[PDB]
């Protein structure tokens, strides 16, 4: 490969678990809670750090 951004950096390859990964077709709405799970972890954190900026 040449200038395939993704696998060029080794780091950026590690991020291709989001984009290129095999994901089953059929899949209830239930699985979105994984992702949202992370969403919440990131929101609490940003929020926490600002509150702990005045607590």
């Amino acid at each position: 490969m040449t200038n395939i951004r993704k696998s060029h950096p080794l780091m950026k390859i590690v991020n291709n678990a989001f984009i290129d990964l095999p994901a089953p077709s059929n899949i209830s709405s239930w699985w979105n809670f994984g992702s949202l799970l992370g969403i919440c972890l990131i929101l609490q954190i940003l929020t926490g750090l600002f509150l702990a900026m005045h607590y």
Binding site: A17, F18, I19, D20, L21, P22, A23, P24, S25, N26, I27, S28, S29, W31, N32, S35, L36, L37, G38, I39, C40, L41, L43, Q44, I45, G48, A52, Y55
Partner: protein
Amino acid sequence: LETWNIGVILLLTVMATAFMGYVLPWGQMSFWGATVITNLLSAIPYIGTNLVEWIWGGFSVDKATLTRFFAFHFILPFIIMAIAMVHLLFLHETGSNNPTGISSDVDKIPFHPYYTIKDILGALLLILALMLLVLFAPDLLGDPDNYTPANPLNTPPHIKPEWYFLFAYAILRSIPNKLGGVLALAFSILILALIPLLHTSKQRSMMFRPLSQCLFWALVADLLTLTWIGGQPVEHPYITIGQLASVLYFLLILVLMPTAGTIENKLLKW
């Protein structure tokens, strides 16, 4: 299994987090809730007592404890993120199961094309709920109305954990004995890691097995029932109910489901 065991750790780590953050604001509910939970650790016979006193940094919950929670609340979430990623790592080695319960390798899709929009959409609804709550009914879901600065002689006769921890408080109540209640409280949550071993059916998918779909739902509704007890006066009516709900929960998880599994397998002739 390996992914399940990380999950479990995840779950419990957040659980600690939530317990200490709620105490940071140092209000009547927080103050007492910490005492009664922490003290519930003094059930252990030999150590307990000494150990509750180390955790608190003294004999009560004064400044010493209050700054500890601030520090651990702060540092848990960072540690937890590492865990999450570790969790993701393991899961990436076998991909996502489905409603049918069968491998999909014969049907696989681009995560980017499809699942990035799904996830963004998911967000959109998630945020919705978070702002709906936060903007229209800020306090609604935050049962506790105790915006009262904590006075160590004062007590809301109705002391209870939040909705996430409501189930835990209820589990402790059904057992007369202190220690029996702490064990059973841990087992509530800690019973998760058993379920792998309990699995009895040939179909990892409950989707094709009615009977577990019925007892799965019931557990969920038993779990709702337990959450209710949590905000209940600890009196006869609620006691007797909680006690049968706490047996139902462990039956559903330990004994009913596993049998149902077998049955279904035998009806399919498997």
